[PDB]
């Protein structure tokens, strides 16, 4: 009895999964590409770990995350594969529960990790208090499409402190601050949405994963997690928190997935 794990997001979640590539199976939970390929971590990312290392039973990963993704190019634009387009790919291919992915409300989990690029690209040009409700509302409408399809189990990851990535640190403490304050407002409104959605539907199981606090813990005390500092970059994915100046490595993603496991037990795969 597999858990069908449909994920949506940006570079922090991408694996290069193609809807026309090898599809997920008990023998190949990720489908394509090989576990550990296609990520920004030098190895598995949090989805690969959740699927093959932290899983308590069979998890099949259909990972529609695309690098550079914002929520909707009508709001904060970036790349064609925005979150709205990922939901469209889901609607086109998997929403009708084909024989290849015969999911049901009882065994499908829809995981969304979005906002890094929305905030990254709009934190200095928009008013967080009045603009992030628009982004969050678009995210909610996308979620409602899956709810209409029969999805009932949802996992939302709030935005991690990319304010403290080397990419943003280099821009100076003023910029870090302005980005971080914007991001905090986004994450509050995300939390409020997930709570309202959960309450309003009444028949959904949802998890809001506070990636922000988790990675902030590590950044604040890196040596306690085996990292030499909070700022070095190493593309081996394990020597430093950061695999490149904007993305954490496989060691971080594994720590996050291990932190996420107990919180995911109620979703059925963990």
Question: CATH no. for residue 236?
Answer: 3.40.50.1110
The DSSP call for residue 23 is P
Structure tokens at 199: 């309450």
Cβ–Cβ < 8 Å for 256, 213: no
Q: Rounded to whole angstroms, how far apart are CA atoms 228 and 252? A: 13
Cα atoms in the 13 Å half-sphere on the side-chain side of 220: 7
Q: Can you tell me the distance from the alpha carbon of 54 to that of 262, in angstroms, rounded to the nearest whole number?
A: 9
φ, ψ at 63 (rounded to 5°): -100, 100
Q: Which two tokens stand for residue 243?
A: 């695999």
Give dist(CA 57, CA 186) in Å, integer.
33
Place of tokens 């790919």: 89
Helix axis angle for 128-149 and 83-93, nearest 10°, is 0
CA triple 248-256-59, angle to 5 deg: 115
Q: How many residues does the chain have?
A: 270
State the pairing for strand pair 59-63/205-209. Answer: unpaired
Q: Counting beta carbons within 10 angstroms of the beta carbon of residue 137, is it exposed (0 to 12), middle (13 to 18) or buried (19 or more)?
A: middle
- Residue 133: exposure state from Cβ atoms within 10 A (0-12, 13-18, ≥19): middle
Contact 181, 128 (CB under 8 A): yes
The sheet carrying 3-9 orders its strands as 59-63, 3-9, 108-113, 153-157, 205-209
For residues 159 and 115, the answer to whether their CB atoms sit within 8 Å is yes
Report how far residue 5's alpha carbon sits from residue 267's, in angstroms, rounded to the nearest whole number: 10
Count of Cβ atoms closer than 10 Å to residue 26 Cβ: 8
Resolution (A): 2.0
User: Crossing angle of helices 250-264/211-220, nearest 10°?
Assistant: 130
In 3D space, the residue among 236, 261, 222, 263 whose CA is nearest the CA of residue 59 turns out to be: 261
Distance CA 252, CA 238 (A): 8
- Cis bond before residue 226 (omega within 30° of 0): no
Q: Report the chain's terminal Cα–Cα distance, integer Å.
A: 13
- What 3-state class would DSSP assign to 216? helix
Q: Helical H runs in the chain?
A: 46-52, 83-93, 116-122, 128-149, 166-169, 173-201, 211-220, 250-264
Query: Largest alpha-carbon pair distance within the chain?
Result: 53
3-state secondary structure 148-203: HHCCCEEEEECCCCHHHCHHHHCCCHHHHHHHHHHHHHHHHHHHHHHHHHHHHHCC
24 secondary structure, DSSP code:
P
Pairing between strand 247-248 and 242-244?
Answer: antiparallel
> What span, in angstroms and rounded, lies between the C-alpha atoms of 191 and 142?
16
- C-alpha span between 30 and 42 (Å, rounded): 16
How far, CA to CA in Å, does 155 sit from each of 109, 160, 217, 264?
A: 7, 15, 21, 8
Give residue 74's domain range: 3-267
Domain count of the fold of the chain: 1
Q: How far is CA 68 from CA 21, 176, 196, 212, 234, in A?
A: 21, 20, 28, 19, 21
- Technique employed here was X-ray
Cβ–Cβ under 8 Å, residues 269 and 109: yes
């Amino acid at each position: 009895n597999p858990t069908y794990f449909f994920t949506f997001g940006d570079s922090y979640s991408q694996t290069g999964f193609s809807a026309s590539g090898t599809q997920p199976s008990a023998s190949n939970p990720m489908g394509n590409p090989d576990l550990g390929i296609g990520t920004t971590t030098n190895g598995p990312n949090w989805i690969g770990y959740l699927t093959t290392t932290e899983n308590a039973s069979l998890v099949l990963s259909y990972n529609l995350a695309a690098g550079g993704a914002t929520i909707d190019n009508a709001l904060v634009p970036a790349y064609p594969g925005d979150l709205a387009s990922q939901f469209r790919l889901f609607e086109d291919v998997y929403a009708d529960k084909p024989a290849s992915a015969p999911w049901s409300a009882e065994d499908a989990v829809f995981g969304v990790w979005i906002g890094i690029n929305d905030i990254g690209n709009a934190y200095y040009s928009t008013d967080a208090e009045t603009y992030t409700p628009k982004l969050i509302s678009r995210l909610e409408s996308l979620v409602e499409e899956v709810y209409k399809n029969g999805g009932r189990k949802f996992l939302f990851l709030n935005v991690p402190p990319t304010s403290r990535s080397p990419l943003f640190l280099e821009q100076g403490e003023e910029v870090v601050k302005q980005h971080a304050e914007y991001l905090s407002v986004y994450n509050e409104n995300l939390e409020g949405m997930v709570d309202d959605f959960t309450k309003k539907k009444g028949d959904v199981t949802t998890v809001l994963y506070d990636s922000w606090s988790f990675m902030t813990k590590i950044l604040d005390d890196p040596t306690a997690y085996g990292f030499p500092d909070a700022t070095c970059i190493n593309d081996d994915g394990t020597s430093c928190i950061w695999w490149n100046n904007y993305h954490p490595g496989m060691k971080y993603h594994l720590l996050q997935a291990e932190d996420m496991k107990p919180k995911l037990r109620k979703l059925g795969g963990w």
